[PDB]
């Protein structure tokens, strides 16, 4: 059942700490490694910066001949001497608050304009932002790999070295995302045109899908500018599919290059998306990796968690992200490649009290491994800091190797993990609720995001009213997922793409947050799910279009639903809850045929029904709610209770979060107080026990079954 | 010298609680009022919703004839019986998460298209958003005033009644701001044309300023779409000046109508701008009231503070907003018309332990009065809630008058306030730093804001690189003001408009965050300031343009400055601090004749100088830094120390914030812990422990 890392045929919690040799006095490297090992950590992790080691074009130093902290070889040897396994991350990009994101200054001065990401006008977006498939960029990247990869290969575990894992590049697409502009480099334009010709084969076939009138493929260009017609939406949809293939081509090229050096260790990649302490856009960025995860079962993706604080304001972000990684990568453990320790920026504090709670909450939320980022502070040598001289603050160790407050928090957490890992790693929560992940709603990084400078998608111009980004942020991430976690109902997330019917029928309920569009394959899957005995909850819309916004009424027809879309007050009544505020004036009005009406508009028109279809049950709500009122929690709770799903515990304070993890031998009860209140409460399993929990604090109770 | 409310001829801290009679079971009105009074509160505050009382056109109920909670008259009687003064807020707009923002449904169903705020295409922006100077809207507003104002007039403090203050409308421009669109209603456009003719007199004068090619004012159109040309910037700038006159015309029309009923109590207005627990846009919104504040010294503006939490993440917002209100309104107390109690949003928690600290921090930060918003929760009657059934959560009292956790926090704070008010209200901080407030940098709500749906202002299209909203948000509000607060250096803010030279001379340093444009009057003011002996810190640019982007180099020439704008790495060195991250590649590179170079690019070009001019001192930095590294705090500290300015205390833990407030005989030291850490420290001009997100106040007799 559970996915976890294994060592010596036993479950093993991966505990790594990030220690940047290049930012630490090499006379203190050993002390940093000893103090990390003394916390119970098994692994150390570092970037190997291209700029740091290719000091001028074709002049390499890995031995500290020109600066003692260029002695990568000695750092590798110390990791082995201090019995730590090593994760190496040689880029080409590292980010790492390093000048030019780790690319050499000499490189960026030499590269031609066509090596850079370009805007719609052909202008350079940023002087450190390359176009990934640039011939010149990949030539210099390969020359870098030619010098660093033999060193990595020599020091792998299979040659009795400490190196067990290597990250390829760093958060692919993060630089493009943060710039707020997409890449229109000519390599992108030309590879896109090849993609479209391969995809459609004839211009007649493309025109039939898009409803365009092109005479030839030579008339068609990568889409630019705002979406005004459904044909512009179609063009951008394919452009999103293309970018997923483009990032798969990039990582495939790096992987094939590294394998040529005899490097057989585990390859990793790291997922961006937290900003200002929440992760509602992370699902968009993880979706850009869809083709990499389909084609490379041997690259393990891990999350980059940057909570910044730990409170009800962001409590749901880490669990939703952990669940969405599991959905997209169900055969590998859920791990954090970067797991916040300290703060990347002086003005954004990172308190030990918060992060210690985050670490325990992460265990509650199913994490199987992590890399404390940053375990060790660094001091940039030679002006290499992007933003200042000091690299991170409020870490476990300062750059000198002094213990800071966070060290004691990590020791406490790691001690618990080491004591419990053989049982805890094998535990699961009992999820009776499955939530669908429909990746195409996330495919909007070119047209609609929190970071994109230009809003290119306005669905009203297309005759639609449900924006897929509004749906996936407010109705799903901040809405349903936040609500279920707040209500202490366990859920799983399943990727609906090529999804096995047998993997949905384990759940008492499947929840689908739907826009007006959904592909035929997914409409058919949800149809079969209900006909064969599944219980489906679907809102705010029965879809009637496919991903190209062409007619597709499969689910509507299979479920025998008739509806009209009508304007009314935002407030509806649902299951006897009055004044439920909904997101839209427009609602689906269902006729009551062979159904029980359960939701009504202010004019008493039917906007939600329940029915029995084949061996299954359907609940459809023709209105949108996330979690912006107490009525929304009441409605989620009522929906869950339709199939008699029960919480694992009765807890006297509804603002206490809990998670029960168990196997045949052991039960762990995690209590999380995400609130600035001392809470005294009682609980019992579904004679009560009393607990007092401080503000922003945790309790963990272990029972031997 | 301090400004404060007065009761019984003594300094009086205004402690008001918001209690919406229209959202409370009338059987429990007395119980809510008694529980509010038992916290030591002196005043209760409420809207009087137009929709609630004009139940159909020309059918008024203020006596509970049709619903017991329409008995406004009984509520007023209970306030008197329970010895509370009353603040009333009859609109016409109330917002208050009330359907139609408090306008009657029957009114919105009946109004013509031309009564509504319209976008660039002539479409209605929102079915509850009227154009303020709509004739139809003012006709019906006046008929509402005709019924509610005689009731207020009878019960006003000038007739020895309980009503001490009345708010006119609610956060003027807030609906416009939140809609993300500006009003192009044809009456508004006609008033804008009248405003332009009044301002320029002749089309030749307007053409000389804008570089336009009109033959007459008949050719003139309201600016729309993106700014591509400097002439489009000019038209939008005057469109901003016009909206400030427009809001003054609206509030003048309401005030004159109110005064006609013999209402001579204090009139108020309330300032919006907090969102997601910070207030970096509130200075833009307060700038929209510039003409109201200049023309109506009898209308007291108060702040609507919505911190949501209390930590280092938002510690600087309330101080900066309080200081900006003081700059724009120096002759009235700084007070919060809405002072967060509970939460408007169930999913956005408001912890009693957070807000208790916010209340004490607000005292440290110079607040003189406030209105707990919401003291009492409400239940929306008859589906009249904009949102769900319940109005506010985690308040002092629930809608049934049950005491909640916040009640005891408010009782505690109120007891400290009543014990200390006579001395505390007469205290000020000793500011030796003044920070300039240049209002034109804030006049962008039509073209650039956090809420505007399309950015119309792209300064690179105008041949500029310093965006005024970036400057005022990241370099000023979240940069310099946050850094000074964090470093525990007192500052004052001064409005540079019509500013007295005499008012700047008391300060040891004037800090000016400058874009490439600044009007002649302000350039002249800053020139005279330094020549006469003042010490000026100016960055990131010596301005070379006026507000119409026409050449204006008064300050530059008067100070003998020469520069070239050149591209370099973002990092500079300044005062021996290496690796100072700056916002722009473009920097001013100064000629150093008769100057001391003090900052350098990565290629060692001079991007900052110090100089003696007349009797004074100039420090100019040709680069933009906010607060995103420890080097930024070090640079601000180095700059303050150029004129030997000292903190009032030595505190062993640099992450403890303090404010020293004094008068001739009393000192209050407010220690504030904005961090999730128990901190132990000592202080001197003596060892204290403060819990996470908490406070300690110390008194010292002088
Ligand atoms: O916060 C925005 C982004 O900043 C980047 O520097 C981090 O590497 C990402 O993980 C993060 O999502
Ligand atoms: O077990 C001791 C731990 O208890 C938790 O409840 C607290 O949040 C931690 O601050 C503390 O280290
Ligand atoms: O948060 C955005 C705005 O919301 C409005 O409902 C409040 O009345 C304002 O004070 C506030 O700034
Ligand atoms: Ca000169």
Author numbering:
A (entry chain B): 6 to 691, 698 to 716
B (entry chain A): 6 to 690, 700 to 716
Quote the study that presented this structure, word for word:
The IALB_1185 protein, which is encoded in the gene cluster for endo-β-1,2-glucanase homologs in the genome of Ignavibacterium album, is a glycoside hydrolase family (GH) 35 protein. Here, we showed using recombinant IALB_1185 that this protein has glycosyltransferase activity toward β-1,2-glucooligosaccharides, and that the kinetic parameters for β-1,2-glucooligosaccharides are not within the ranges for general GH enzymes. Kinetic analysis further revealed that the enzyme has wide aglycone specificity regardless of the anomer, and that the β-1,2-linked glucose dimer sophorose is an appropriate donor. We propose that IALB_1185 be redefined β-1,2-glucooligosaccharide:d-glucoside β-d-glucosyltransferase as a systematic name and β-1,2-glucosyltransferase as an accepted name.
In order to understand the binding modes of ligands, the complex structures of WT with glucose (Glc) and Sop2 and the complex of the E343G mutant with 1-deoxynojirimycin (DNJ) were determined. When a crystal was soaked in a solution containing Glc, the electron densities of the Glc molecules were clearly observed in both subunits as the β-anomer at subsite +1 at almost the same positions as the DNJ molecule and the Glc moiety of Sop2. In contrast, Glc is absent at subsite −1 in the complex unlike in the DNJ and Sop2 complexes. If two Glc molecules bound at both subsites −1 and +1, the 1-hydroxy group (β-anomer) of a Glc molecule at subsite −1 and the 2-hydroxy group of a Glc molecule at subsite +1 would collide. These observations suggest that binding at subsite +1 is obviously stronger than that at subsite −1. In the WT-Glc complex, Arg349 participates in substrate recognition to give a stable conformation, whereas Glu102 is still disordered or flips out as the ligand-free structure. Subunit A of methyl-β-Glc, Sop2 and DNJ complexes, and both subunits of the Glc complex adopt the type 1 conformation, which is likely to be observed if the aglycone moiety of ligands is absent or small.
